[PDB]
Design a protein around this ligand. Structure first.
Ligand SMILES: COc1ccc(-c2ccc(C(=O)N(Cc3ccccc3OCCCCCC(=O)O)C3CC3)cc2)cc1
Ligand SMILES: CCCCCCCO[C@@H]1O[C@H](CO)[C@@H](O)[C@H](O)[C@H]1O
Ligand SMILES: CCCCCCCO[C@@H]1O[C@H](CO)[C@@H](O)[C@H](O)[C@H]1O
Length: 266
């Protein structure tokens, strides 16, 4: 009955995921494998993609142009802010999240969204680059490496994490629970009702462990492997925030979106 109740719980998380995220891993893998995106690998193709592809954020809305590396950074911010919106609606579609007081909801999103973003990023990434523009573009990792420091350096660690994470071969139904476990985390600073959040987290983790038993019957040590990735994501986000601090200190002409300012504020 423990296993039975959690299975319905997992299906509710999965449906929240499918209702709220713009691209599934199923979709992304089908594009990345040829099951075709315009390849952006230098300045000329970058400019042609701005001219030819359809962007959710219209270029004229971006902050005034500065240079190629910054422009890429502004497109990174666009997508991170948009994923915060999607992660917020995902969390609110989980009844036990929506039952928490709104200030605890904000506390959980503040400290969890980047961990979740970097985990879901793996879905659109392979060893050679990542999808952009709703899957209609592909930006090469070697191009992103070619950008000037500090912008190249804030990008490459996410590729390293992603390629390792994708070796575990999670599908969307696993990711739904994994992401819900990252957001419903009782460790976050300043949480008001810690025992309640810890209870929800524990339910999700038990749902996840049983989900992996059914969906991945032949995988060894997969649930522990994913608990370790959750710890790896915390360190990736610590390092990311440290790099953001250096961009705020040393790249004073680069704008940072106000919502991201509030996330890094503390
Ligand atoms: C026309 O030419 C283009 C060239 C590049 C791009 C582009 C757009 C989006 C993404 C992206 O999905 N990203 C960003 C991203 C991906 C990998 C590594 C790092 C990285 O962003 C680090 C900085 C993010 C700071 C903002 C913040 O901290 O929230 C996902 C994390 C959300 C990547 C590249 C678009 C057009
Ligand atoms: C939907 C967006 C989710 C992420 C929002 C980022 C949270 O920012 C925080 O908002 C609080 C006000 O509620 C302030 O008290 C904090 O000083 C501030 O850091
Ligand atoms: C000010 C510097 C920020 C420059 C980067 C551009 C931000 O992009 C978009 O900003 C909108 C306003 O909130 C969000 O609604 C969108 O989701 C987001 O995609």
């Amino acid at each position: 009955p423990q296993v039975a109740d959690l299975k319905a719980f997992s299906k509710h998380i999965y449906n929240a995921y499918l209702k709220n995220f713009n691209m599934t891993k199923k979709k992304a893998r089908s594009i990345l494998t040829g099951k075709a995106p315009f390849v952006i690998h230098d300045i000329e193709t970058l400019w042609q993609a701005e001219k030819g592809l359809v962007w959710k954020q219209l270029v004229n809305g971006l902050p005034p142009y500065k240079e190629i590396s910054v422009h890429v950074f502004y497109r990174c911010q666009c997508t991170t802010v948009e994923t915060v919106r999607e992660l917020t609606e995902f969390a609110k579609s989980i009844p036990s999240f929506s039952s928490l007081f709104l200030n605890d909801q904000v506390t959980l999103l503040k400290y969890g969204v980047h961990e979740a973003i970097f985990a879901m990023l793996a879905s659109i990434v392979n060893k050679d680059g990542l999808l952009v523009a709703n899957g209609s573009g592909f930006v090469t990792r070697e191009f992103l490496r070619s950008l000037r420091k500090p912008f190249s350096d804030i990008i490459e660690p996410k590729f390293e994490f992603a390629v390792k994470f994708n070796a575990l071969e999670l599908d969307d139904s696993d990711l739904a629970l994994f992401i819900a476990a990252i957001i419903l985390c009782g460790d976050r600073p300043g949480l008001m009702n810690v025992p309640r959040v810890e209870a929800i987290q524990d339910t999700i983790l038990r749902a996840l462990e049983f989900h992996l038993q059914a969906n991945h019957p032949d995988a060894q040590y997969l649930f522990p492997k994913l608990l370790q990735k959750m710890a790896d994501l915390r360190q990736l986000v610590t390092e990311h925030a440290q790099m953001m601090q250096r961009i705020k200190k040393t790249e004073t002409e680069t704008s940072l979106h106000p919502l991201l300012q509030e996330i890094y504020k503390d």
